[PDB]
């Protein structure tokens, strides 16, 4: 078979690959380059002080263990292989109850490049808290945050970065705007630190 060689390459990738350890445990810091494509800004439920957003949250990082050589320069793998290897545990700090869409199957993909760079795109629907000061109601304005970061790994272990410059990393689709009574003027992208009880973590935010 022509393509059987590719299977062998896959069978050679996971040989000895311990998924429990991050790419650089005790040697480096696993830099993660992340960015969002807001496919649709969902309705803002002022009753719950909550809003909804549907995003193609996509991340990338370098894992030297998965370096290979073969015919194609990029391997586009199924969602199962993502579960088979290490991936970041990014979550949303202000999120309430989101769902990763899996219709018809998990909306995930993995692209392993020859140099070891990965690309793990998702399709999330995050409904997150948007605190409000309704002193000027109905003539008020809000800044709903979307703050995300690693759950387990501190600053010394995992650090997040924006792929492009911060302003142009987060992109909102023009046709996608489900807001009824609100108007989306724009977004501001930033990064910062949170010092929790366990340790210090990087939190990447979009207001």
């Amino acid at each position: 078979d022509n393509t059987t060689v590719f299977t062998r390459i896959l069978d050679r990738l996971l040989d000895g690959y311990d998924n429990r350890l991050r790419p650089g445990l005790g040697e480096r810091v696993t830099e993660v380059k992340t960015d969002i494509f807001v496919t649709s800004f969902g309705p803002v439920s002022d009753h719950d002080m909550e809003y909804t957003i549907d995003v193609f949250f996509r991340q990338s990082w370098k894992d030297e263990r998965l370096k290979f050589k073969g015919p194609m320069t990029v391997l586009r793998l199924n969602n199962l292989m993502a579960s088979k290897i290490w991936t970041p545990d990014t979550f949303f700090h202000n999120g309430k109850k989101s769902v990763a869409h899996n219709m018809t199957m998990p909306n995930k993909l993995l692209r392993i490049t020859e140099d070891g760079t990965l690309l793990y795109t998702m399709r999330l629907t995050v409904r997150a808290e948007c605190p409000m000061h309704l002193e000027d109601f109905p003539m008020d304005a809000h800044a709903c945050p979307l703050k995300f970061g690693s759950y387990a790994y501190t600053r010394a272990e995992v650090v997040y970065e924006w792929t492009r410059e911060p302003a142009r990393s987060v992109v909102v689709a023009e046709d996608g705007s489900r807001l009824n009574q609100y108007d989306l003027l724009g977004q501001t992208v930033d990064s910062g630190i949170v010092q929790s009880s366990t340790g210090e973590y990087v939190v990447m935010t979009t207001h």
Partner: nanobody
Amino acid sequence: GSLRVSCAASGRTFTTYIMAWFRQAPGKEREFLAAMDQGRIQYYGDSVRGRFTISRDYAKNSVDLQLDGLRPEDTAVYYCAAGAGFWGLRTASSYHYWGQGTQVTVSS
């Protein structure tokens, strides 16, 4: 040298507001220094990343700034500000409350 600049709010609970510090060197150019959210998340300016540390005390409704590694160019008036970040979080236009300001001078 090391210093600590405190700011206490009275007349309103700023638990849900974003509390920040700003700098004004002589020359009329307000510079962002640090800011802290309801979620304890700290943002900093690139000039003072890791030199100054911002903190908040929500029970006492105050914001503190611990300054380390003061250099002679850091002489300036430091202002304490609060307000939700609308079109901002790094711009003075988004803050509707400001402190009287405190002069700080560094002499070698």
